[PDB]
Amino acid sequence: MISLIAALAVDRVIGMENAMPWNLPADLAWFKRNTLNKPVIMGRHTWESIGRPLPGRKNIILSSQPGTDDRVTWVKSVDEAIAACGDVPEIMVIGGGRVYEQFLPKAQKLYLTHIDAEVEGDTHFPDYEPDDWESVFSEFHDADAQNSHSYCFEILERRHHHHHH
């Protein structure tokens, strides 16, 4: 199964870099917990932003612009990315915007962090039809001394499909 995992500010703005508009170590812990021991697929922009393989995960980089780094697995299409993961229970797609857009139709689960921040960026999470999904988990957290903004974790499972997403 393929899942997407993303942190969304207002207007579905995402940030892949370390310098995110927000500082949410709680969200990074959520990300790590839900991706550990699973393959992660990302585009090259996200790869360069992370800047080292995510430990404890197979790192697959989708790009028609492959780099040379031998520490990760480079693939040239969505289908090839999926094949490179093989027979695992769950493949995690970790962005960025265009990669999420291409993988959404193949995904059956979303792990979202809805962050109460309005921000400057222009990269967005894809459009999805909310009536196509069931919200099977949600948990709101207030900001605290370690986490700059309030946020709500959510897990959605797909119930319906309308082809483009």
Ligand SMILES: Nc1nc(=O)c2c([nH]1)NCC(CNc1ccc(C(=O)N[C@@H](CCC(=O)O)C(=O)O)cc1)=N2
């Ligand atoms: N929920 C969520 N939050 C994010 O911040 C996020 C996301 N999903 N999906 C893709 C994405 C792309 N950017 C990044 C940037 C850095 C790391 C990273 O360094 N992760 C470490 C955690 C570091 C820590 O323990 O504080 C890891 O091992 O996962 C991951 C993804 N970021």
Ligand SMILES: [Cl-]
């Ligand atoms: Cl990317």
Ligand SMILES: [Mg+2]
């Ligand atoms: Mg090589």
Ligand SMILES: [Mg+2]
């Ligand atoms: Mg299987």
Ligand SMILES: [Mg+2]
């Ligand atoms: Mg800008």
Ligand SMILES: [Mg+2]
């Ligand atoms: Mg825009």
Ligand SMILES: [Mg+2]
């Ligand atoms: Mg899009």
Ligand SMILES: [Mg+2]
């Ligand atoms: Mg779309």
Ligand SMILES: [Mg+2]
């Ligand atoms: Mg409070």
Ligand SMILES: [Mg+2]
């Ligand atoms: Mg229904």
